[PDB]
């Protein structure tokens, strides 16, 4: 399951629209934050033992951004493999609005390769 | 409790206090949990809002309120232990706050004359 | 808790909140009861100091403590209900406090700009 929509725009053009579930995002942000916690040190303790509420407060927004970008990319690649879509050149990511704690939808626009003619 | 009491200057007095970082985190966590029970997020109903979300959005605000609450509570706990009390409005002189670190501050005020 | 939210200028916002007089009195009385439990002074065993003495000595400090606490909790409750998110740390602007009366104060801060 993923929630993917394919569209034909014009000519060799296509558009893939994907919605990432809020819980998938939260799970990703969670593990990324624990990895980031391993890198932070604060006088009062030894590196890596910083309280999660502190790491989330300070790095949550940046990490949430990183994760969104990463998930958009990974889900797109999985989508074209499953849908057997062959992009030509570099695709363009068209992100939707992101609402904290909610599902996230975006589109990816690109041209595909025409059938190899010999 | 780590308290320091300077004394005298025409009844004037100064109490410097240092709050444990852990004490700070416990208050913050409790407040954030309260917040997670009140926040409503569209499409989400499975229990309280995740803490990473709450800490990110409400962390700075909740932590500032918790620092003010603790400065006050600890000053009171301090004077109760030092068997003394202010005569006028106390002046809070905060030190630098460093995320996740012990916090130190001072409180200046006067006491009623005795013999 | 009466709440009024308004724009000042640009991303600046002001939330004005009024705290009921008895919400304050109830909180003050409760904290005074807990302070009495901790106090051992003026010849009395711990927790047995007459309330008139506890009030005369720590009433003012308790009042200050409770007001600050109520201002914070009421602000947070307010931004949650109004669904407005401060970009940084909020600035409190208290009104004048009249013992036994309602208390109105304002909180100023900026919101994040629209992503657009």
Swiss-Prot record, chain A:
UniProt subcellular location: Cytoplasm
Membrane-spanning residues: none
Residues with ADP-ribosylarginine modification: 46
Effect of disrupting the coding gene: Non-essential; synthetic lethality is seen in a triple tig-dnaK-dnaJ disruption, although this depends on temperature (triple disruptions grow slowly at 20 and 34 degrees Celsius but not at all at 43 degrees) and strain background.
Family indicated by similarity: Belongs to the FKBP-type PPIase family. Tig subfamily.
Functional description taken from the UniProt entry: Involved in protein export. Acts as a chaperone by maintaining the newly synthesized secretory and non-secretory proteins in an open conformation. Binds to 3 regions of unfolded substrate PhoA, preferring aromatic and hydrophobic residues, keeping it stretched out and unable to form aggregates. Binds to nascent polypeptide chains via ribosomal protein L23. Functions as a peptidyl-prolyl cis-trans isomerase in vitro, this activity is dispensible in vivo for chaperone activity.
Note on domains (UniProt): Consists of 3 domains; the N-terminus (residues 1-112) binds the ribosome, the middle domain (residues 150-246) has PPIase activity, while the discontinuous C-terminus (residues 113-149 and 247-432) binds substrate and has intrinsic chaperone activity on its own.
Subunit structure of this chain's protein: Homodimer and monomer. In vivo most of the ribosomes are in complex with monomeric TF; binding as a dimer has also been suggested. Uncomplexed TF is in a monomer-dimer equilibrium with approximately two thirds of TF existing in a dimeric state; binding to substrate PhoA induces monomerization, 3 TF monomers bind somewhat independently to a single substrate molecule. TF and SRP can simultaneously bind to ribosomes; TF binding is abolished when SRP is bound to FtsY in the presence of a non-hydrolyzable GTP analog. Contacts ribosomal proteins L23 and L29.
Name of protein: Trigger factor
Originating organism: Escherichia coli (strain K12)
Lineage: Bacteria, Pseudomonadati, Pseudomonadota, Gammaproteobacteria, Enterobacterales
Span within the parent record: 1 to 117 of 432
């Amino acid at each position: 399951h993923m929630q993917v929509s394919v569209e034909t725009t014009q000519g060799l053009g296509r558009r893939v629209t994907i919605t990432i579930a809020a819980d998938s995002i939260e799970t990703a942000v969670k593990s990324e934050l624990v990895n980031v916690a391993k890198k932070v040190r604060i006088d009062g303790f030894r590196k890596g033992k910083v309280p999660m509420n502190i790491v989330a407060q300070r790095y949550g927004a940046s990490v949430r951004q990183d994760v969104l970008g990463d998930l958009m990319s990974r889900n797109f690649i999985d989508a074209i493999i499953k849908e057997k879509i062959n992009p030509a050149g570099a695709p363009t990511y068209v992100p939707g609005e992101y609402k904290l704690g909610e599902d996230f939808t975006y589109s990816v626009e690109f041209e595909v390769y025409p059938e190899v003619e010999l």
